[PDB]
């Protein structure tokens, strides 16, 4: 530890000018929360209920998320729902999208 909101890693094992920047970039690319694929989520009010509009698409991950109505989720991706739900669901989604 160094400060209230600042620390330092010492990497005493590695002895190379190369791969130190690689470790830095690997650290900078580490996920801390959220599900993969989603960029940002926005809460909106449609009627008397609250919905979430998402700039990413990850159907299975959202189905795994607690507090999500699995039987009413709708997505913009047709191949995802085709692989997850089936071919008739993909047909209906194509009709609705057009």
């Amino acid at each position: 530890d160094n400060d209230e909101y600042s620390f330092t890693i010492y990497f005493e094992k590695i002895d190379s000018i190369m791969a130190l920047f690689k470790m830095r970039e690997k650290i900078l690319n580490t996920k801390i929360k959220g599900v993969k694929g989603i960029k940002r989520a926005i809460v909106q009010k449609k009627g008397d209920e609250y919905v979430i509009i998402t700039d990413g698409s990850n159907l299975e991950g959202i189905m795994n998320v607690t507090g999500v109505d699995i039987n009413k989720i709708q997505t913009n991706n047709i191949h995802e729902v085709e692989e997850v739900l089936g071919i008739e669901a993909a047909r209906e989604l194509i009709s609705r999208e057009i």
């Binding site: 000018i17 190369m18 920047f21």
Partner: protein, 98 residues
């Protein structure tokens, strides 16, 4: 046209039309008369923060520490299956012309 890249691994490569492939920055710097790494990092800038980014590119050319080694590296890039002499004069002439 001369194009300069900054790859994912914090290295800088210069590649133009005549010479195939990419050439590391310190290689071209040595071929043009900059032998000491301090000379390169002070010709780039005087800012320590900017100077810190030159380290991977500086060390990627630690094998080549003389102008002639850079010159015949460029020659090997452009001239294949020739002796050292004609290689170095061809490399220096293509550097001085194109």
């Amino acid at each position: 046209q001369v194009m300069i890249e900054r790859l994912k691994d914090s290295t800088i490569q210069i590649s133009f039309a005549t010479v195939p492939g990419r050439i590391p920055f310190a290689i071209i710097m040595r071929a043009l008369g900059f032998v000491t790494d301090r000379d390169i990092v002070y010709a780039v800038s005087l800012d320590p923060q900017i100077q810190n980014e030159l380290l991977p590119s500086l060390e990627q050319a630690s094998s080549i520490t003389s102008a002639e080694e850079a010159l015949d590296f460029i020659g090997n890039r452009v001239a294949i299956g020739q002796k050292r002499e004609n290689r170095i004069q061809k490399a220096e002439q293509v550097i001085d012309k194109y």
